[PDB]
């Protein structure tokens, strides 16, 4: 049975408890009568703390009673950090007095405006900047440095401070969300904190835009420094909540259509009717880039249909590029009619890629995955062209293909051509950020690939582990006498686990039910080694098929549960930047052969209105909610107070 | 006597003793009392069989309290005085010992650990990758210059924990690389009597390094909370198979020099069993490169999820195994009179033609194991007779097994793994940072070479009591001004507005 | 270190703050006594807004007090 003693802590006398009880219960008579002991020493310091760690001024701030605070400041009680205690409770009547005059409850690296910005109260920061309180700039104790930077970034990222200062709130919200996103990764461990601050900066940048009540105002916001320059800068800073704002999407859709209007039949027939006439529109744009017909190609939806039709007819005459209607098997290609039709599409992709890589300066270019896919596609196309040039010279024997060598240039050219047009047919998947139905699903595709690419780091070393086991167990069994056909691609499954390469290949194909279990026998009577080979092959089949695959579907399941809160936002951001890719000036798909002082004035006026509206929508909403009925209670008490005292 | 009043009496006094306010006002070191009390409540979660939610919640609140005391440090000097208290990091080692994973996934503890761990690592992926592989290409240079001169010349690199982690990682993967190399046709023909290769003579001063390393960490752990780590079991089976491989190659090296062809050898010949045990050894040695995944930020929590959902795969492999033995009891009983082996140069079910599958119980178990992968090709159920009823019942109770295995138990397995992973992502990063913490603690002492193994307290107790007094005072403040507040915050203002007006009225008379 | 200035926004005088404090705290005596400056010009418009964007009628609606609303509508 523990007979323990209280830890050492300072204890209050009983003669100050009669003072503090009147402080907490809230007198003005008896508190002042106890405060008549200023000249007459009643052997006590009136600011000496209780066991709760409070001076009486902290209670009078804690109970919102302005007149006890006024009394104690009139009789010169020691404040210390009473200003920060008042600011943390966001009592305005205390702070308006305390501005007008060892232990801390706060980190000493806090200036009075920083925790004011942390509390996100408008008028407290508004009266502190009237006193001119400066915040430091975020350029020994790795604790105090980190929490100091975190405090001043969280203070600088409040909506009220960006409202009252920082002349363009859009730029400060954008750059500050960028810097917090950078420090999420650089500072390795407060990534929830920095991530949440960057997210609140993004929500603030959205909610400023949400307050526009005129489309003229919205145009003055987005077209500000050709056009849509602030929207281009918003795409640049990954402000995806800002650009999935609805009215921005109405302005973008009104830009995008330009008389598209219906129902599915009329829309389908008009889209395919435009798509059957894309070379007509492109060549009449080239012979006359004027207001005759080329206004169609200037419209973004119609040039999207034209690029889509040109890309899928490139795919159609790649589908056509292997039929038996069109060459026999000889060394020396002398390319087809179809290859001569292919070449002024591939060269158009070469020119298009060189242009968009030149005007992006390889930065945030290669950072797009589709530029990597274009790069490998066009590299394989150039290698195909070069290898067909090499095979066109020096080879005219017309010897039969079955008698050719391995690594002959024609065969490698045809293989690289197939590896090229699998990619060229595959990146028709990137037009799915235009349909309303197929968009978010391919966003989910592109995001759960980022966890499939973690299971393909676990699974590959599981693979190499079992390959190290199996080839070590079977490499003495090299049965190849006879054997016109070898390997594991054979009609009869030959010696599978002989080399490490065929071993890796075998264990890859065993997860599809294609390695048919007599690979584990050898022509011997070595039933122990055969049994251990079957046992450690079954172990691999278990770990692959019923463990790692099911962990893969569980990880993809909850990783998709994480995303549907921000699904439509990311989809509208993607279809936005796809739409921004069709507003300039690159019309043909494959047929490639003062003035600011007024605008700055109007922009400052619209920002003044938007900030005023947002301050209104913050005060009348977030202050309300419940404090809404509590303020009515305070009114019903105070009004009756003045009814009573004024009656006398 | 009253097993009710005894149980609720103990539960009440543990719940009373596990409050934060009582540990604040008493119990001179609150860290030790929170730690030992969380340990005792975790024990009584299992020993007392039924109030495991209650005892578990009390232990969790003790862990949160031990975290929130540490969260109040506002100086890195204070944090150092907390963690380095009784070589160094002794309280942190004791916290790892008591499974205080919320305590050690505190952020500022992780900053102090990372500042210990790097010692000038600083960038971006290209520079970090090239510098890591540049260090990793030079590990025997660094190790042998540590051995010839363990001083401030160059061995300060190996004293740094990140660089010795890179050196151990590079040595372990070059052990794996010259195990990958240990089967190529470039390097012996098939004879009884190995006389081991150049590669085996290179293997042996890695395996002996693992032997010495395992003996050291098993000796200084006293086999308790040693074998309780799963990786020590994996090291134990790995090194046991290696020693069996060495011993069997010694046995085969003597008494055998016939050079007779391998196809004419016996079954259970010592060379063949040695090579099989060597393969079963290096599957494990290549496989426990998976345990370096508590160092990457991306691969960490995923392999934590691996290691935790294995604990339910290991329940379906108790249900599924008796389903297996049930259908084996059915099928071998139905087919053991059909023992067709006349002719049959090749037998069994590993054969090119699927022979008599369900004859013995062993081949039956083997058949029903392989049938869940689509590898038992359905003509195993015929026999050379016209017994179409028994053939049909064999196919019927084989299809019943295929249904129960493939579309029932596998889907129950994915449903159980699904919600069992839904239970864990509230405490995912905490467990990952705890794991990478104890991996980092494994590289702070003193074992530098990876394979090349050939009063003074009264001041500190005074400062520790002062820091505890400040931390307890700060925590009592952060409890009073927060949890008492929240709504009672506006209610206390209402009480003020009523009572102050009361004294305004009565004092007016 | 950013030495910044508050954005341009209209600021309230101190002689109307003594009026608005009685409006928010909820008098009928002193609010009407401040509203005795209808004929006698006390150099202020009584409907001039605070930094919160409110006229005093909006506070009296915001604090549910019908008689201050009746008073302000009675004094136009
Ligand atoms: C033969 C089939 C099985 C495979 C061949 C694929 C094509 C038939 C599909 C692949 C992508 C599809 C495109 C995906 C997206 C769109 C966007 C769509 O535009 C809209 O729906 C926008 C409507 C809006 O403004 O909201 C026009 C059709 C189009 C080009 C689709 C046209 C038909 C395409 C080329
Ligand atoms: C050939 C491939 C398909 C399989 C071979 C596997 C290796 C290439 C992988 C397996 C584990 C990997 C290791 C997993 C974890 C790390 C931790 C990583 O350290 C960090 O990232 C720490 C960064 C930080 O301080 O936050 C250094 C690379 C390393 C050793 C990786 C190096 C590459 C390894 C050895
Ligand atoms: C994660 C656990 C991995 C389990 C690996 C495993 O079960 O191997 C199955 C082994 C491998 O099958 P065979 O080698 O063909 O017999 O099966 C048996 O030996 C008997 C049937 C026993 C069937 C269970
Ligand atoms: C948990 C329920 C288990 C059900 C087991 C089962 O369905 O056995 C299928 C049986 C087994 O297939 P066979 O024996 O090859 O005919 O199929 C039939 O007999 C007729 C087709 C009927 C197909 C349904």
Numbering used by the authors:
A (entry chain B): 18 to 118, 135 to 172, 187 to 272, 284 to 319, 324 to 388, 391 to 648, 652 to 660, 696 to 727, ...
B (entry chain A): 187 to 272, 284 to 319, 324 to 388, 391 to 648, 652 to 660, 696 to 727, 731 to 753
C (entry chain D): 18 to 93
What does the paper say about this structure?
TRPC4 is one of seven members of the subfamily of TRPC (canonical TRPs) channels. TRPC channels are Ca2+/Na+-permeable cation channels that are expressed in many cell types and tissues, including brain, placenta, adrenal gland, retina endothelia, testis, and kidney. The channels play an important role in vasorelaxation and neurotransmitter release. Several studies showed that TRPC4 and TRPC5 form receptor-operated, Ca2+-permeable, non-selective cation channels.
The resulting sample was homogeneous and suitable for structural studies. We then solved the structure of TRPC4DR in its unliganded (apo), closed state by cryo-EM and single-particle analysis at an average resolution of 3.6 Å. The final model contains residues 18–753 with some loops missing. It sits inside the membrane and forms a cavity with helices S1 and S4 in which we could identify density corresponding to a sterol. Since we added CHS during the purification of TRPC4DR, we fitted this molecule into the density. The four isoleucines and four asparagines constrict the pore to a diameter of ~5.3 and ~4.2 Å, respectively (1.6 and 0.7 Å defined by opposing van der Waals surfaces). In our TrpC4DR structure F572 and W573 form part of a prominent hydrophobic contact between the pore helix of one protomer and helix S6 of the adjacent protomer, stabilizing the pore. Interestingly, we found an additional density corresponding to an annular lipid at this interface. Since PA has been assigned to a similar density found in polycytin-2 and PA has been included in our purification buffer we fitted PA into the density.
